[PDB]
Amino acid sequence: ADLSELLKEGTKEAHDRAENTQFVKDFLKGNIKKELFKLATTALYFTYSALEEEMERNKDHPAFAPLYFPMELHRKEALTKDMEYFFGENWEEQVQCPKAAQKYVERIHYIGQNEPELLVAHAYTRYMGDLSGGQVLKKVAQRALKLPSTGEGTQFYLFENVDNAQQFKQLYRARMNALDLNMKTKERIVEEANKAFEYNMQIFNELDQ
């Protein structure tokens, strides 16, 4: 079957575990105060910074190059703005990567440097979720925190260079299923995605405390 298919089925339960953590629920209800939201944005910054560094490094690698979309997908810049908006211009001296997130960052660097054919598992669990879910999460954060409607602190959640999010998701999926992969590597990808989803849950749990 198709890689995108194995991932939708092989990760549904890990995706749901992550989706049902106490952090996520109180997020969707508007009950996450500013300081916790900043800590969560801090974790997105180090996480996406590592992931996009590894995708840049492997931008020509045949098992990944078709999915390299810096203009459409990359989040480091938008996350830099949000960090500047919440912390001030000296933000980098003020933050430190959360410990659970440091474990995800280490995993991302390992994959991009030793098994780049697995990098797709990490881009899928992050960017495809962000594309379809974005605008919903954006408004919740703007309300709960009285964020300016001009978009400050919330730019992570807007993909300005993607004009039809459900259309880009199709393009991305089509390219993924066209990758030259045997069934061995494909199910490696599927369990690497489950790995990634569990890393997300570990970060949500560290954030709940």
From Swiss-Prot:
Species name: Homo sapiens
Sample GO molecular function, one term: metal ion binding
Part of the intact protein present: 31 to 239 of 316
PTM entry text: A soluble form arises by proteolytic removal of the membrane anchor.
Domain of life from the UniProt record: Eukaryota
Ranges per topology, Cytoplasmic: 1-209
Alphabetical GO biological process terms: heme catabolic process; heme oxidation; response to hypoxia; response to oxidative stress
UniProt key word tRNA-binding: no
Membrane topology according to the record: Single-pass type IV membrane protein
EC number: 1.14.14.18
Annotated site (Important for catalytic activity): D130
Keywords in alphabetical order: Acetylation, Endoplasmic reticulum, Heme, Iron, Membrane, Metal-binding, Microsome, Oxidoreductase, Phosphoprotein, Repeat, S-nitrosylation, Transmembrane, Transmembrane helix
Family named by the database record: Belongs to the heme oxygenase family.
Gene Ontology CC terms: endoplasmic reticulum membrane; membrane; plasma membrane; specific granule membrane
Catalytic class of the enzyme: oxidoreductase
Protein name, as recorded: Heme oxygenase 2
Amino acids binding heme b: H15, Y124, K169, R173
Reactions listed under catalytic activity: heme b + 3 reduced [NADPH--hemoprotein reductase] + 3 O2 = biliverdin IXalpha + CO + Fe(2+) + 3 oxidized [NADPH--hemoprotein reductase] + 3 H2O + H(+)
Signal peptide: none
Coiled-coil region: none
Activity-regulation annotation: Inhibited by metalloporphyrins such as Sn- and Zn-protoporphyrins.
Compartment annotation: Microsome membrane; Endoplasmic reticulum membrane
